[PDB]
């Protein structure tokens, strides 16, 4: 039973060591390729290599390619293995192309949909359960759900970002929670689904651990959208093929809140700045809330209602002003990072990430409490 | 029998139209990403977008992802379908990473080996014939051959390059020749191997046709190593899984000659310039042979022997000189493009590519003559 899992653990540890070693080896290449960026929440104007998710993602693929023959050494699970790797690999690829080319916002939705196609087709060919428990047969709409799941998880991680070790950290907690959940369900019942998930979650964990080694505060490298795209698809892939997307989405609680809280800014009903990461008080050294200021006359009818409702619900900190240019509204940037800075006041970057990571652990523990009483 | 082939042809035509439309749409993004280069054989110093093989390659993948359920709508060929796409997709990815990052020469060998792993494992799991006809069982060495085949075809195309429409053009002739060969063998005998090859060769053809639309003289876009990597793996994949790598390698005759003729320069026994593309006589407008000048005292014992042998065989045009700096040897750059310019004299770029393409057609016709008497 654990014979291939042993081999998977062995190659995943080698993959950790590979990721830790290779990340600083390709440093030059990324900086030369202009694949870098400043640490926007630090005074240092130096450029730190970006898109390092491509190196962990690459290690992850090569690990699993070598692993492929072991579970076989029957095709119903083997199809799902090569199928899920196709989807993950295509996603690391289109994700990296997006990092290199900076495609229009439409592709943040089209690329995950594109890459998710092998998962859908494997589910189609291996005769997948289109019926859902609330007892409803969604049919074609179930495949729309599977497509959208990949789109969701990638962007949900990507919009809960911008502080040292958060993106890679939250994924690290999520994969660990999936691993723990798989091991519990490996004791009986649906087992071939959970031994399957472990085959991707063990290598995803140790490679991301190798990435976080160089990403954790102070960040020596940045993960890029390549990592957020990669993570999202790996999670959506194991959720779908393991048939536990419901349970997996509950492990996405901080990501789901942060998304809906961001919805008025994403939909531009309230002006949305390109970067909604907190400000650094250079005197304090700690992070402070970021704000989006705008002319109140330019704001839409629906936008004034949402902002008034969210302020009264003790969620958004709004600040009215009136200069020579006119009357302005300096409202709080709608994200979970800022809401923690609203409630708990200014927080140092290292503790802020670690706080959201703890909040992530809390949610996983709540899900495990829901599911096992 | 042709029901899925009809669907494959339909999506491949849509893929052509997609490639022609999208190539000029992402132009901005590539130039902005510094993914471009000058037309080194033209006076214009403007920068033309590079790595457009990524857009044809991307279209190729999405085409085939949509095609996946059709041959099914049994897993022995379905595994080989998802397996070959994994290898091709990983290769387009690592090929593009190489275009973006400019990795050391070692990776021009490591990336194709890395990406070829799913093919090997599919061949392993689906119980592939390790025995070869000269009757010898190569076993592990057969897998070494499969790995090296991908390495060969990618670089063999990549070193027979540097003139408008050559890289994409030679692949276009090769895929057409594989298509013709498949259709002949579709009449009987081994058929499931040739209907399989057609599934990748039809979409490879029409996407490359869309690429060559913007690449053909005068090049409006450049294909990049991404295309050479992509092409090589798609050809190695169909050759391996179709069991016709021998026949396929004979379609690689101009690529095999150009490789062995380049061997003294590649091995640096004779100095090798980074670009061995012909020179443009600005007065003539036509292309002229390129040369590699070096001090004869610095040349190795083996290098003097090779150069003397190759000169007497009427292959290399050597020119001795002696300035104030010392005695120099200005020998001809060892490539098939230059050998055609040695034998046929200066040739215009458009006719030179078209001449090598004709030479490619000639070789395919020779192979078809070998094989069918
Ligand atoms: C090695 C050196 C290193 O960097 O170690 C750091 C630990 O990293 C984390 O906090 C990273 C946190 C790592 C936690 C990931 C896994 C979390 C939970 C798994 C269990 C979930 C089950 C429910 C400490 O550095 P510091 O700057 O002091 O903070
Ligand atoms: C459309 C407009 C266009 O560009 O068409 C050009 C044709 O392209 C080729 O020559 C490209 C050559 C295309 C040949 C590819 C297929 C070749 C052979 C297939 C059969 C092989 C069987 C053995 C003509 O342009 P020009 O500058 O005059 O040369
Ligand atoms: C709609 C939405 O919510 N978009 C967010 C998303 O955009 P988005 O994903 O587009 O932004 P990027 O992936 O380009 O951001 C990466 C850049 O952010 C900065 N950075 C990133 C990580 C880190 O620990 N420290 C750091 O300073 C660096 O300049 C880095 O180069 O993520 C950004 C931070 O990643 C947030 O500003 C954006 O508001
Ligand atoms: C060992 C070997 O044989 N290496 C060759 C290989 O290197 P290599 O593959 O490394 O070179 P590249 O792929 O970077 O060359 C692409 C560049 O070549 C020029 N270019 C390319 C295509 C074209 O039609 N016109 C044009 O001018 C452009 O500057 C383009 O940007 O291919 C080059 C041309 O592709 C040749 O010079 C090199 O000698
Ligand atoms: Mg991002
Ligand atoms: Mg090249």
Residue numbers in the entry:
A (entry chain A), B (entry chain A): 7 to 79, 91 to 151, 162 to 400
Task: Pull text from the paper.
The first step in dolichol-PP-oligosaccharide production involves the ER integral membrane enzyme dolichyl-phosphate alpha-N-acetyl-glucosaminyl-phosphotransferase (DPAGT1, E.C. 2.7.8.15, also known as GlcNAc-1-P Transferase [GPT]). It catalyzes the transfer of an N-acetyl-D-glucosamine-1-phosphoryl unit (GlcNAc-1-P) from UDP-N-acetyl glucosamine (UDP-GlcNAc) onto dolichyl phosphate (Dol-P) (Heifetz and Elbein, 1977, Lehrman, 1991). The DPAGT1 structure (as reported here and by Yoo et al., 2018) consists of 10 transmembrane helices (TMH1 to 10), with both termini in the ER lumen. The active site is on the cytoplasmic face of the membrane, formed by the 4 cytoplasmic loops between the TMHs.
